């Protein structure tokens, strides 16, 4: 198995305030499941090859994604900002896969990335355990 | 706008505890968003036509969907049992559409609904406000 | 160090939904802290001579506590029902000690206990791991 | 009746990465319970002249308690620092009433609050509304 564990930072009350709205798991990999516990967030995956997606929206209505897996027993990560409520993370987590239009970023196999989103919200992912199957990032807001 | 709010109750401790492991939105009628308040669990939706997810785990390993949403202005509900690991919410969501396997059920347009796993447990779906725009669900586990 | 993990199975619609409004916790035995995971809630304590209390309100308006501790290194239990507003768990939970009202009870070192409500509301609270450091209950609303 | 909601904002994974521990209600003003919803926490209260704490534990092991309440219909809070592990909420929330040694800072009425703990962890309450019985305000922990 893989575990993903997140830990979410929110840096600006001036970006508003974030909360999860929604959590896919991809079928790859025999599948995998989300968790909670002590305010962090574990996505358990059956092997390497697989996914999730986090989508968040905040009080001030901003619709973006964060998404973690392995790829070829490398983890990945990626954002997506700007969304439009029908872009749901249903949507976007079959993306990375099946020569869809993202699969080049899970390919990329990053360890760290950041984006500010259109209307100025900064969201970086940044793992703090990059090797190995028990891996750690912290999801940065703001 | 339709909200979905559902209530969860577990009724026999002999099943194992059932807790959330992933929560889709479908894309129709403007996707939705899932929100947590007081223990209850909404699903707001951008109009007739879409649904959501939520997928349980036990702690005895068991895996099963409940699907609420909104088929021509009336609710409708489905539970999933006996799921296998790679048989993700992602999976099981779209299933409902694009004359997929169980979208027979949801045109049933159903206020209730009750199924026992090959494992033994039962699961029912019942809504306690059937019409109008903010409907409201007990699931029972157990 | 001793804990008790606590899973709440609400088995009965008709007596509302309850949420919990507080969690308290003694100052014996190095105090001790509560934690969330997995839809669970653990008690991890410093040693034997302590408890925590939940206080739960439905969304009928009944209020009610729930206290766990070890007592002379066994588990303890009580449910207290009929609670007014002002009678919060930081009001209850001293009530065990220092030779107060609820004394009695903590000294039964019950691994199991049932009460009924002024409303009608059944509660139970049953110890499945009984003895050791880490103990395990069910908490029944039914 | 008096509501307070918190949103908290955590800054910096230096300082590690806190949780909830512990939540009380003091006894004045009829009561109040602590609620969540969307990532947020409300405590509601009866009237003018209580308040509640929480209580936050990191994952390095420091423990810290915000309080926020109502004084003679305006709002106050503070933060406490380098707490023991015996130093619960329960010990806390009494201490500033009945003469005890926190009175002083409740009476202050404060709609901001900074302070800098002994490992370097800085926290601010900040009141966004800050009159009124509906208070918002932002815990930063930075």
Known sequence: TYSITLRVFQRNPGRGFFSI??????????????????????????????????????????????????????????????????ETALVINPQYYNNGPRAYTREKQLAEYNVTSVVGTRFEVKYTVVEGNNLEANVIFS
């Open 21 to 86: 709205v929604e959590k896919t798991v991809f079928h790859y990999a025999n599948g995998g499941t989300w968790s909670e516990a002590k305010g962090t967030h574990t996505l358990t995956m059956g092997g390497s090859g697989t996914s999730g997606v986090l989508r968040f929206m905040s009080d001030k209505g901003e619709l973006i994604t964060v998404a973690v897996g392995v790829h070829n027993y490398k983890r990945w990560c990626d954002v997506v900002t700007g969304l439009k409520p029908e």
